[PDB]
Amino acid sequence: NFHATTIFAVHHNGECAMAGDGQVTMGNAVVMKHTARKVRKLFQGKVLAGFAGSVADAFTLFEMFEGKLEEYNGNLQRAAVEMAKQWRGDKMLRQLEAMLIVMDKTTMLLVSGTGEVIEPDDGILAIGSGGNYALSAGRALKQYASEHLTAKQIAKASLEIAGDICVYTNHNIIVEEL
Template sequence: MMEGIHAPSGRMRATTILCVRVGEDVAMAGDGQVTMGDTVIKAKATKLRTMREGRILAGFAGGVADALTLFEKFEAQLERHPRNLARAAVELAKEWRSDRYLRRLEALLAVADRETSLLIAGTGEVIEPDDGILALGSGGPYALAAARALALRTDLPAAEVARQALEVAAGICVYTNDEITVLELPAHEGHENR
């Protein structure tokens, strides 16, 4: 069984997104590099966002315009299924796979709330990692390996595991830089998930 998730990068060579869950800590990190072919055209892009008043983290790998379209579609699914991240993700994947226009979008999404971390792909996959760690993009395999090692061998919180793992990926992958953004879910307050 897979203990972490890395989505194949295909032509999506412009990013690394990593979601880490350590105990009750949940964080997502992304680098800032955007490339066209072999040329870096932006170093400080933001590929992460929060949704549902900060209760959901989301990140993307792939085309920016494609990802923004998918974020809008995902937010619409969250409106329909506000207390069920997995259901919203499955409904997005179904729509993405069946809609002729959406099928052409080249992006992958990572989403996480307090209970669940998911990778969503246009081929219909909605995958939850067994160990709470998932990675997208060109530097994904390096970040995933580093995050697994850090999570197993240290007592670092999720945000620090994510940051350090992305630093490792940036040192290896030419499509990943060290302009790292880290977002965390707020401290656990009761068990609210709206």
């Protein structure tokens, strides 16, 4: 019943940033902890990935995906595919409605338990309870504000706005960059 934390990833001005909040919501109305860290670097810091869902789910995926990386030599395109395939295979895992973002220097993708793999056109991806508000914020900035802001600043911001619009997203915001 836990509600998905909000994660955002951006490629801007030759920079890659990914942020997420710390809010943990049990049931409809209740917040257990505000400090959750949902974003991490993999492949020896070559890739930034994040997952909205459970902690033990977070790592099992992270595990088997970095597997796809090592197999596929850090090709995000083929690894995520082979990842989504293997996700779609697992009886207990297909179930997860939460999704996964991955990105490296080159690109970013979105992987789901339904076997979906999505690459954005605008180099912006957002998931989680508040992803949509975050996505609205970032695009607005990146397209319109393009030369007045960094990725770290676009990403950080995008999680603030959603933090204001959304009940399931808080203001403790962890930011990583490649």
